[PDB]
């Protein structure tokens, strides 16, 4: 269900082109004639409002925005009951006869597991996890448990529900912790970091994506280079510049990945320009980054403007370490900013204690604040040193 999830994701916010939502809408109507996508489109209008929420024919009666092409016509309306008879009335009667004839054990479990995948395309989630629970008691080895954790993971992928799905994803590994091969051991930890990207835990969850996407891909939902853009942007985002030379710019998979398609423009254009300390050509590569990468990708657009605040402070911080004092004519008259427009970027970063820099408003001499031998031994020691008696007397003064 990645095709309808990735392409129709442009229905959230697209400020670039109008045909982006139109071209992606063709894949929605093409894939829905085979398998039922109806519960996916119903949630699109129930998530974001006053943008695309008025395009549904029957939810409430509304017409708005630019898109008349996403809807259920009189054909799919009559096909709504046709798919329900095949996915419920037809399948449940065949499995019910298996319990009466008592044929096999794991074969009956795989029947409920395969049937449980149809409930994801139905839109009733109470019977989705119920059928998986019936096959849970019939599951013996780890072969039948592979598709169980995949169907449960689709509940948060297909319905975009990060609340009730993460409880079931953790319940499988917590009740019985085995993992089998290290391939699945990374799968239980991958789904853990997916729901943490919705709450935006930053480098905690995002550090596992660059490791998993550079080794193995499920290959069933998508391809290797389609979701590779998630690890390309978060690669330089989470990892410091010191380790970018031994990891990102030199990699067996990444250097062969840029030759597959030009839609990345991260591990190549942004990495080489950042390692060369040249910000003249580095910034125009960011112009095609957010547009052609962050917006179309799902988990990347969940952040969007959350990337730059961490990245914009870091790109200048690395330049301040290479010189004691810089010049305003280098920043204002050359690369990324003008004179007056510089106050908007570094103006809000310093009061947040993100970086320490000094700009001269007369002679135009940029000055860098260097802690020298102070560092965390003196100043930062006082800050985090007060937490010793703060956390001790918090619950300690009340005894029991």
């Amino acid at each position: 269900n990645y095709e309808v999830s990735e392409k129709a994701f442009l229905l959230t916010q697209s400020k670039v082109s109008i045909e982006q939502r139109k071209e992606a809408a063709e894949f929605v109507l093409a894939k829905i004639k085979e398998e039922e996508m109806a519960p996916y489109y119903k949630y699109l209008c129930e998530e974001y409002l006053v943008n695309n929420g008025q395009s549904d024919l029957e939810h409430d009666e509304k017409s708005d925005s630019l898109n008349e092409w996403i809807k259920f016509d009189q054909e799919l309306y009559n096909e709504l009951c046709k798919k329900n008879e095949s996915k419920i009335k037809e399948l449940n009667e065949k499995i019910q006869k298996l319990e009466e004839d008592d044929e096999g054990e794991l074969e009956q479990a795989q029947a409920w597991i395969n049937l449980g995948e149809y409930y994801a395309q139905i839109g009733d989630k109470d019977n989705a996890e119920k059928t998986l629970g019936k096959s849970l008691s019939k599951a013996i080895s780890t072969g039948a448990k592979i598709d169980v954790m995949l169907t449960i993971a689709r509940l948060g992928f297909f319905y975009n529900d990060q609340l009730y799905v993460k409880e079931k994803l953790e319940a499988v590994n917590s009740m019985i912790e085995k993992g089998g091969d290290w391939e699945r051991r990374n799968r239980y930890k991958t789904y853990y970091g997916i729901h943490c990207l919705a709450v935006r835990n930053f480098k905690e969850a995002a550090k596992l994506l660059v490791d998993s996407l550079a080794t193995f891909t499920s290959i069933e939902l998508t391809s290797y280079e389609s979701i590779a853009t998630y690890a390309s942007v978060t690669g330089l985002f989470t990892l410091e510049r010191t380790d970018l030379k031994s990891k990102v710019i030199d990699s067996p998979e990444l250097l062969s990945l840029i030759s597959t398609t030009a839609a990345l423009q991260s591990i190549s254009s942004l990495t080489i320009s950042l390692y060369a300390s040249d910000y003249a050509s580095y910034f125009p590569y960011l112009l095609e980054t957010y547009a052609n990468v962050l917006i179309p990708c799902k988990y990347l657009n969940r952040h969007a403007d959350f990337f730059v605040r961490e990245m914009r402070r870091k790109v200048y911080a690395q330049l301040l370490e290479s010189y004691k004092t810089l010049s305003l004519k280098s920043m204002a008259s050359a690369f990324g900013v003008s004179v007056a427009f510089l106050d908007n970027d570094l103006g809000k970063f310093i009061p947040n204690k993100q970086l320490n820099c000094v700009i001269d408003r007369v002679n135009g001499i940029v000055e860098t604040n260097r802690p020298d031998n102070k560092n965390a031994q003196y100043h930062l020691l006082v800050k985090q040193g007060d937490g010793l008696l703060t956390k001790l007397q918090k619950y300690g003064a009340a005894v029991r």
């Binding site: 709450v199 112009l287 957010y290 962050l294 403007d305 959350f306 427009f341």
Partner: peptide, 27 residues
């Protein structure tokens, strides 16, 4: 966690990247 959530506005990408286009044309 939640402090980073609200403090980020609609500014930056959609805005500052539109300024970088006209900035290089004036130089």
């Amino acid at each position: 966690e939640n402090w980073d959530d609200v403090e980020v506005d609609d500014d930056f990408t959609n805005e500052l990247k539109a300024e970088l286009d006209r900035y290089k044309r004036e130089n």
